[PDB]
Design a protein around this ligand. Structure first.
Ligand code: G2P
Ligand code: G2P
Ligand code: GTP
Ligand code: ATP
Lengths: 427, 426, 325, 426
């Protein structure tokens, strides 16, 4: 059992630098490249007393790549795997897909082929990017389309950072997100999502960090993506694999948008005063403001829900906790899936980074759940897109790259097809 | 990796260009002789983005100084950082233009433009992969507007795909040190509106207005004015000169700020702008900086933004800071002032930050704004041109070089068009 | 004073690349004025079916335009559509054949045939020009030396070309000669969708100046014949290398005039003609003293259903436009 | 948390405002340079309620000094605590008002009021959550009554929900250092009676009357008068600057003291007031302090309360003390003197105490009283205004600035109305 990953954009490599430092300290891998069947999923055996991750950080702009080469984690990652481009995507879906995308996929696509040939138990793929930019939108759809036609049957665990409702980093991110989702709607099996102001709200209230940064945001994100793959690494009472995320969460092949959340988030001084059990954290993850997306779950209905625990959590009190969620009428489940619960447990507990913002806890939980609540966000993104599309704003840059007005209409109607599917399935 | 070819045209362009290499040399820690004496290793990470490597660990700048008056080069060469430039790049004529756009564009420029194209071709092919062109000129005069705008046309013909960036100072009616400003102004914007992808509209009176209120210099010279505008030149190209948590290249700034091919005339700004007698009484936290960035009186253009609506704005921060306080300041600044922002765009702000601030300051940022208030400058410039053109005043000197009066009318046709273009989106 | 721009449509038969793939014939016609596509009517002035020959399209569309441009007004005809839609065959065709020849030789032949029918005292001074906008440069095809021309304004602020090779012509056969050598110099590339893919916009001008000796009344009319390229998708064409640069400049132009039709349809204040320099040529056609007639071409295949629907609604936005004639 | 924006208008307002920051700086233990050198940790608990944090552990005060005479700022800036204030807050004109309400309200104030609104907006948005405005002015003169009352009207328009607190000194017939006092007085109370929620009526002759009997200073200056009135400014805002057993915010004082929207003119007082030659012969226990608080001669207003009836009174104590002796003193003080208290209110007294007394004193309190005896001041002020207005004396100077004589009559209509309002409840 093994799995490979590729990181795209500033959002990907910043999570890439933050997640692989977490994976190395879990398995006792020192940052100099060296220290049985626990690290074989992500890390390889480089002859004798040396390891290499199964990672390929790709990015067109070279500032992030050489910083990793001149960073602290020099000897861990392969120097050849750290791919760098020549010219930035420049916040454009077309530029990272046709001009700069086509001339760099050929080094990239053949690399993941031979990097998979040395492996034998490749379960699937997981990517890291953000559709708010150019390289995260154009190049990501290109490679994911280029490998889906080759492999197809293997899974694809997308991790995209969508823009917030009112907070935003760019101005043309509806154009970047609406075009790349036209290709991602059919090829991606599942895609977990993260938001900007929502994750700031997590560390503001519970973790009381009044001045956080992206370095702190990626740590708890690393706890999420490391905890979902913690079942295949360490032994568990109920082992789950990456293929469970396709069967239990995707009721229809074109409705493949779960939410993401994590608990318990608690500081050092607050950890010793707050009680740690499954009952209080089971209510915390279902709390609406404790999610990683500004979206009201009370408005919609949960299509499916998955739970994955860590640490010394016995199966008694965890089953009594979810039974209290069923009779709690604050949230409402859809009639099309009454038994929409997938429980998981791993024995290895949540770790802690030296000097990190999160505290050590003897147990944790991460919930991924499909719901019809995210239709209003697509309505919001589609609504604001019509305001700029009516004035033809920021269009001359895309057609200057090689595109036209036609596929903008395809990107509009394809999201319009998604809304009528979300209101139909939500009946 | 993504080299930028610098080209200093005109008298003022050589001054701010000379100050531009001065202020960034302290950031990279380069001696005036050309050797490195810095402290950080990241200064050498992206020293090639502006400089070229040479023997003895010497770094010559990729600057091309062009001017039709040899006395200007003697002052730049005899400056503090005058010896670091390449002697071969100092190409220049002998006879000045005398504040005539026709002389520096048709006759006096045409004899020298064959000499400068072979020089910039050397710096272009010598690099690994060129990104764009960072030019400095003035819309007034003949050598800045005539010859500086000419090579913009030739570089567009040779390199139509690269970015054409211009830091251009422009005249105003309150402060006017030249009689032929509106004729030179209206002829220059005809070329800048069609060829260049991005331009920064800097008004000279606002350089004096900002130094009274915030900086309160009692004896300001032109060198003090060059310092604050050259900081903006360092802010726009900070993301590729040093690493950052959210890098924005010059092309990444273009797509967010240039919603239409003609509407690319920006309005720069910079902060912190505080005197020495009031530095201790100010907090370097970002909310005190954000209110100064979007302030109506902080920018280096005299157009008041409250009389119009912002089309799109960008703020490139510098220094280690918290992103939540940075991002949330962009929320309340636009929603509380929704009248001064267009409703047909959901988010007008573009964010960017770097981990390496300027030397001597821990927190700083640069304000970049494309607003519809800039048409007020095009209004007064157009009325000054139409007031002098309607009786053919000061045109017989231009006809001596073979220039036709229809080109002045064609420049006048472009003036009201771009004025009406900004009025469409307000 | 005000005349509506005539919007006509034409569908073609399925070419060799579409019948072997198995595309369905979705083109459904209802009379002459309107066409039904996917149970959606689209009203036009005249829709031409696949069986419409070359001579039938000319007599229906551009027959009266020859009379209007000689009366004293200006004229302009251009074709919008996607690649392989049948824009080149509609206008160019095969010039040396009587039946297979397109519109632009038929426009030339009707002008000279009309002059022979007029009295001898009407002296005609016809001068021809031909250039193309390729890689954002106006390269002349009548002369290979100059590759970029300027567009200057005339006495009434109407933009037009300067420096172009204005060949003074006498007989109609000479006009056929300069058209043949011009098309031979045309940079025609090959792609998967069309071997004879015109990768740029060929503008052909016939500046017909006329004056009567008795009444001493001078008249002129600018007759623009534009044959644009196709707004094709890169995934369908499979473009790579130099052809990508050719796709950029054509897509800027069709998107630029697409803003002009939407600006003129919704009735904007500024009407941004100055987005692309190709749009600067078509100012007098859409907002001048001209009688414009757009003829959109589309394919009946199901594989190009999205781009063809965009062309029809683009035609609907063209119906609400009026000239200042 | 509940910040208070200070605004020093007029000459006297700058003096007592300068003394206000002086006396509280010793309580918080702030150096004149701006650094902290105190002893208690509670001083930093609520230092942000008046000051703003800055680099180097420096605390700049949130003071906005406004005056139409630049010589006043030179004396305040050159004072003991003059260097701690922000230089940007020192906004001021050049030409004085010359004791004219029309000049400082219509012409001389209107050119500067655009400049001060942008300054107070900076201090208002920079805080976490503003509570109110602590203003100091004088009803005499033109710059205090004209421009000071003007921005009260503008702040009411922008912030209608916040508290508008004013420590206003007012003239009297026995001590009158200005001829145009009743005209300036009657025009100022027209704005204070409608806009402000609370006001402290301080009479200048009572500042001299209290220093003869109790303090017995042989050579008193204006600085000695500023010390006792500034202590009252510290007493009103003690509950939110330090913790206490019964905290009363400025809004909590307003609802108890302002029974009707117009009857909000208070009568301050302070104790212990004892000379150095009689400090050893006095007990600091609360009954000797309570009899001094409600004494007819202790207050800083010349209106004798025995000639009327108290509408409502508040006493904010300071220092560690016993509550039973405090509360029981409020019982016998009102029931024994039931003639001097209204029978249509069961309890006129409001209690409050703090655990942190002033430096150098272990027991202290501030007396705050709304009494119907204040109409005697409005009587004599109205008769002085009517005596000069009935023949239009000293009005032609006001008409030069475009002021109408009907506004003087409208101010006269407000004067007898509020006089009759106090007479209704006696
Ligand atoms: N902020 C600064 N502005 C300057 C400086 N020098 C000139 N100027 C301003 O720019 C205006 C015109 O720019 P130039 O001095 O360069 C005139 P130019 O050299 O281009 O033509 P000629 O000298 O006649 O050959 C000028 O009138 C000033 O208002 C300077 O050093 N700093
Ligand atoms: N208790 C104090 N009272 C003062 C002090 N200075 C002045 N005054 C009194 O206040 C009266 C008027 O107040 P001001 O001195 O401020 C006159 P203002 O500055 O507002 O107008 P102009 O000076 O004409 O511009 C004045 O006649 C004094 O009776 C002082 O320092 N302390
Ligand atoms: N949460 C989080 N988001 C990030 C981080 N870094 C980048 N992003 C996201 O990335 C978005 C910008 O798109 P990018 O693909 O990173 O753009 P870029 O890397 O600057 O490259 P260009 O698009 O060419 O300008 C922002 O809106 C962020 O939300 C990060 O470290 N943490
Ligand atoms: N109406 C029609 N009837 C029959 N054949 C046609 C018709 N239109 C086009 N064709 C065929 O298509 C071939 C080439 O098509 P054409 O070059 O006109 O495509 P196009 O879309 O105009 O290309 P471009 O994108 O360069 O404009 C011709 O040789 C002709 O046989």
């Amino acid at each position: 059992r093994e799995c490979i990953s590729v990181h795209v954009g500033q959002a990907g490599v910043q999570m890439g630098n933050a997640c692989w430092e977490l994976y190395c300290l879990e398995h006792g891998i020192q940052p100099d490249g060296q220290m049985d069947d626990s690290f074989t999923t992500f890390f390889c055996e480089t002859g004798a007393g040396k390891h290499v991750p199964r990672a390929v950080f790709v990015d067109l702009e070279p500032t992030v790549i050489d910083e990793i080469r001149n960073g602290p984690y020099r000897q861990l990652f392969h120097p050849e795997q750290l791919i760098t481009g020549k010219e930035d995507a420049a916040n454009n879906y077309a530029r990272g897909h046709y001009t700069i995308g086509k001339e760099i996929i050929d080094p990239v696509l053949d690399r993941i082929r031979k990097l998979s040939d040395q492996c034998t138990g490749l379960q699937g793929f997981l990517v890291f990017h953000s559709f708010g930019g150019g390289t995260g939108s154009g190049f990501t759809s290109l490679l994911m389309e280029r490998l889906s036609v080759d492999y197809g049957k293997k899974s694809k665990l997308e991790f995209s950072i969508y823009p917030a409702p009112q907070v935003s980093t760019a101005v043309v991110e509806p154009y970047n997100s609406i075009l790349t989702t036209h290709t991602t709607l059919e090829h991606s099996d599942c895609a977990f999502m993260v938001d900007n102001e929502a994750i700031y709200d997590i560390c503001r209230r519970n973790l009381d960090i009044e001045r956080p940064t992206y370095t702190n945001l990626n740590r708890l994100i690393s706890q999420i993506v490391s905890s979902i793959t913690a079942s295949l690494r360490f032994d568990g009472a109920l082992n789950v694999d990456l293929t469970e995320f396709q069967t239990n969460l995707v009721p229809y092949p074109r409705i493949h948008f779960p939410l993401a959340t994590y608990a318990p988030v608690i500081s050092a001084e607050k950890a010793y005063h707050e009680q740690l059990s499954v009952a209080e954290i089971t209510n915390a993850c279902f709390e609406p403001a404790n999610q990683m997306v500004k979206c009201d779950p009370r408005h919609g209905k949960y299509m499916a829900c998955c739970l994955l625990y860590r640490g010394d959590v016995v199966p008694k009190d965890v089953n009594a906790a979810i039974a209290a969620i069923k009779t709690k009428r604050s949230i409402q489940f859809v009639d099309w899936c009454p038994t929409g619960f997938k429980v998981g447990i791993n024995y290895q507990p949540p770790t802690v980074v030296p000097g990190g913002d999160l505290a050590k806890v003897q147990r944790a939980v991460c919930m991924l759940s499909n719901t019809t609540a995210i239709a209003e966000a697509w309505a919001r993104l589609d609504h604001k897109f019509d305001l700029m599309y009516a004035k033809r704003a920021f269009v001359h840059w895309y057609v200057g790259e090689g595109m036209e007005e036609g596929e903008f209409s395809e990107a509009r109607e394809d999201m319009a097809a998604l809304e009528k599917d979300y209101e139909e399935v939500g009946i | 990796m993504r080299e930028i070819v610098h080209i200093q045209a005109g008298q003022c362009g050589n001054q701010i260009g000379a100050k531009f290499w001065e202020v960034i040399s302290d950031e990279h820690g380069i001696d005036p002789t050309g050797s490195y004496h810095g402290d950080s290793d990241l200064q050498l990470e992206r020293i090639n983005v502006y400089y070229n490597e040479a023997a003895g660990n010497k770094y010559v700048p990729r600057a091309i100084l062009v001017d039709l008056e040899p006395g200007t080069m003697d002052s730049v060469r005899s400056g503090p950082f005058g010896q670091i430039f390449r002697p071969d790049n100092f190409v220049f004529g002998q006879s000045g233009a005398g504040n005539n756009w026709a002389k520096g564009h048709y006759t006096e420029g045409a004899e020298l433009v064959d000499s400068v194209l072979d020089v910039v071709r050397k710096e272009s092919e010598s690099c690994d992969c060129l990104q764009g062109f960072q030019l400095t000129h003035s819309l007034g005069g003949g050598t800045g507007s005539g010859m500086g705008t000419l090579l913009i046309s030739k570089i567009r013909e040779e390199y139509p795909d690269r970015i054409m960036n211009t830091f251009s100072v422009m005249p105003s009616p309150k402060v006017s040190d030249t009689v032929v400003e509106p004729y030179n102004a209206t002829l220059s914007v005809h070329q800048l509106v069609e060829n260049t992808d991005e331009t920064y509209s800097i008004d000279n009176e606002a350089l004096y207005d900002i130094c009274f209120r915030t900086l309160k210099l009692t004896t300001p010279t032109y060198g003090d004015l060059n310092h604050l505008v050259s900081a903006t030149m360092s802010g726009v190209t900070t993301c590729l000169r040093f690493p950052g948590q959210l890098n924005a290249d010059l092309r990444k700034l273009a797509v967010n700020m240039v919603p239409f091919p003609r509407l690319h005339f920006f309005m720069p700004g910079f902060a912190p702008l505080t005197s020495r007698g009031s530095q201790q009484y100010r907090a370097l936290t970002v909310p005190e900086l954000t209110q100064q960035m979007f302030d109506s009186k902080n920018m280096m253009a005299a157009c008041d933004p409250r009389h119009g609506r912002y089309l799109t704005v960008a703020a490139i921060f510098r220094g280690r800071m918290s992103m939540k306080e940075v991002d949330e300041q962009m929320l309340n600044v636009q929603n509380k002032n929704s009248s001064y922002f267009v409703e047909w765009i959901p988010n007008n702000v573009k964010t960017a930050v770097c981990d390496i601030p300027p030397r001597g300051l821990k927190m700083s940022a640069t304000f970049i704004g494309n607003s519809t208030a800039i048409q007020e400058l095009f209004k007064r410039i157009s009325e000054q041109f139409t007031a002098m053109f309607r009786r053919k005043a000061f045109l017989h000197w231009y006809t001596g070089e073979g220039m036709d009066e229809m080109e002045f009318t064609e420049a006048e046709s472009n003036m009201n068009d771009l004025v009406s273009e900004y009025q469409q989106y307000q | 004073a005000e005349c509506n721009i005539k919007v006509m449509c034409r569908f073609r038969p399925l070419n060799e690349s579409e019948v072997n793939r198995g595309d369905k014939y979705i083109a459904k016609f209802q009379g002459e004025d309107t066409v039904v596509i996917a149970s959606k009517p689209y009203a036009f002035d005249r829709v031409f079916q696949s069986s419409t020959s070359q001579e039938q399209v000319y007599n229906d569309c551009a027959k009266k335009i020859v009379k209007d441009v000689l009366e004293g007004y200006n004229g302009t005809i251009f074709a919008y559509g996607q690649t392989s839609s049948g824009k080149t065959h509609t206008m160019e065709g095969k010039l040396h054949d009587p039946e297979g020849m397109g519109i632009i030789p038929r426009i030339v032949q009707d002008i000279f045939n009309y002059i022979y029918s007029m009295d001898e005292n009407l002296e005609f001074h016809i001068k021809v020009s031909y250039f193309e906008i390729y890689l954002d440069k106006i390269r002349d095809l009548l002369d290979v030396s100059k590759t970029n021309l300027s567009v200057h304004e005339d006495k009434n602020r109407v933009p037009y070309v300067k420096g172009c090779t204005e060949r003074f012509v006498c007989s109609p056969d000479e006009v056929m000669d300069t058209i043949d050598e011009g098309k031979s110099n045309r940079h025609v590339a090959v792609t998967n969708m069309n071997e004879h893919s015109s990768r740029s916009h060929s503008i052909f001008l016939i500046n017909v100046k006329q004056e009567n000796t008795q009444t001493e009344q001078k008249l002129s009319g600018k007759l623009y014949l534009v044959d644009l390229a196709g707004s094709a998708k890169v995934s369908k064409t499979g473009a790579e290398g130099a052809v990508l640069d050719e796709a950029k400049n054509i897509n800027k132009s069709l998107s630029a005039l697409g803003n002009v039709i939407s600006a003129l349809a919704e009735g904007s204040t500024y009407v941004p003609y100055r987005d692309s320099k190709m749009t600067r040529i078509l100012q007098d056609s859409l907002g001048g003293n001209c009688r414009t007639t757009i003829v959109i071409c589309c394919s009946p295949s199901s594989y190009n259903e999205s781009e063809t629907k965009s062309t029809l609604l683009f035609g609907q936005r063209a119906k609400t436009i009026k000239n200042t004639v």
